[PDB]
């Protein structure tokens, strides 16, 4: 109770240090545009849902836009890999927003089979395909590359970071769609796995006037 009160500032901090982190130049991309989406679907569901807990209206528009966005990226990232050119989906910056805007109203005009099954039924295989065919390539690479030099193993971990964010939101909201507090848990898990996995580490940890390893 009064002890878990520290779990709200977590859904009002880690999701803001992220929104601001995105809103730096280099951190602006389609991937970190949808991951920055799950920030408003964690902050709003923490400064508007967690406090008072219309209150059950934004409770659905929030969790029905998540596993929906999770369905988005799984496909976007795919279209990026299955793509004949460089790694970075074709979803333009504006059409990413135009596509992002339509993820909310349809999340508002909205069921466990419509807003949960459907979005997770394919999301787990559109990604499965990816995490898999991302392996054949991973080393269809020239062995010599990296040991004699004179998609790579890096972008192979960026799908590790996005591979657990989609792999944690499943073990957190499945026992519920099959415990309502466990679902709230994935509110301080994303800006937590983004530290020891993706670039975010420095992006936001040093934004607070150089955290610690700032050549301390």
């Amino acid at each position, epitope marked *: 109770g009064i002890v878990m009160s520290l779990i709200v500032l977590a859904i009002v901090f880690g999701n803001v240090l992220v929104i601001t982190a995105i809103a730096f130049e280099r951190l602006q991309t389609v991937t970190n545009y949808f991951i920055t989406s799950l920030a408003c679907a964690d902050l709003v569901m923490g400064l508007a849902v967690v406090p008072f807990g219309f209150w059950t209206s934004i409770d659905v528009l929030c969790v029905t836009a998540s596993i929906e966005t999770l369905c988005v990226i799984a496909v976007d990232r795919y279209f990026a890999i299955t793509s004949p050119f460089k790694y970075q989906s074709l979803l333009t910056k504006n059409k990413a927003r135009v596509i992002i805007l339509m993820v909310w109203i349809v999340s508002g005009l909205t069921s466990s089979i419509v807003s949960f099954y459907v979005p997770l039924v394919i999301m787990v295989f559109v990604y499965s395909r990816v995490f898999q065919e991302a392996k054949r390539q991973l080393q269809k690479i020239d*062995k010599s590359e990296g040991r*004699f030099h004179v998609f790579c*193993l890096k972008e*192979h971990k960026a799908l590790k970071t996005l591979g657990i964010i989609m792999g944690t939101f499943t073990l957190c909201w499945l026992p519920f769609f099959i415990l309502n507090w466990i679902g709230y848990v994935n509110s301080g898990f994303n800006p937590l796995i983004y530290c020891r996995s993706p670039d975010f580490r420095i992006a936001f940890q040093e934004l607070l006037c150089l955290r610690r390893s700032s050549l301390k």
Partner: antibody
Amino acid sequence: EVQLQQSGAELARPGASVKLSCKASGYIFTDYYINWVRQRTGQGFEWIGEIYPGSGNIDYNERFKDKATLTADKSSSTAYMQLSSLTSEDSAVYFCVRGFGYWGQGTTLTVSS
Amino acid sequence: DIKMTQSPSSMYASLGERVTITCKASQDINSYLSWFQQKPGKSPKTLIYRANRLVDGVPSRFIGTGSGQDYSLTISSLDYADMGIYYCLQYDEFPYTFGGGTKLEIKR
């Protein structure tokens, strides 16, 4: 001016544990994995494993699977190798290569009472 | 894991002649083989990788050429400074396995 610095001499009591280092300085650390090959006295080479500083992937050779544990330091631009429960037969020269291109200096580790 | 024999072992060539060692692995490394030299009291200096792609700096008299399951390091016009023990390494798959090295001496 390319080089992976190494201790050259390391004494350790049987059962203990040394932690060899290798300060590479002459290229971009994270652009090459660096393996750690062991070459006992007399002759012969036995790869202990390879770690990719950039990522984190550390593919150990079965044999040293639980024996050694590689690790890299992006900042210091030096990498390490944790050798636990050292035994008389763990004594040899431990090399730190840049993926078999440029080898290190070498560390004459020796486990002895 | 993946045995890689390496004939010869011992070998005495005189100055000027073209000496040669031949390496043959168990599997089929896709030209993912390398040749280096160990000189007493020094760390190994690599000469060739990708079965034939000379390293930068290695003298132009070294030649690696094999394919699929058998290769061979070779030098035409053996130079005095060319005394030591060359070994072939395969990095096609884990665990990287070394040859056993053939050692070459010069008849004086």
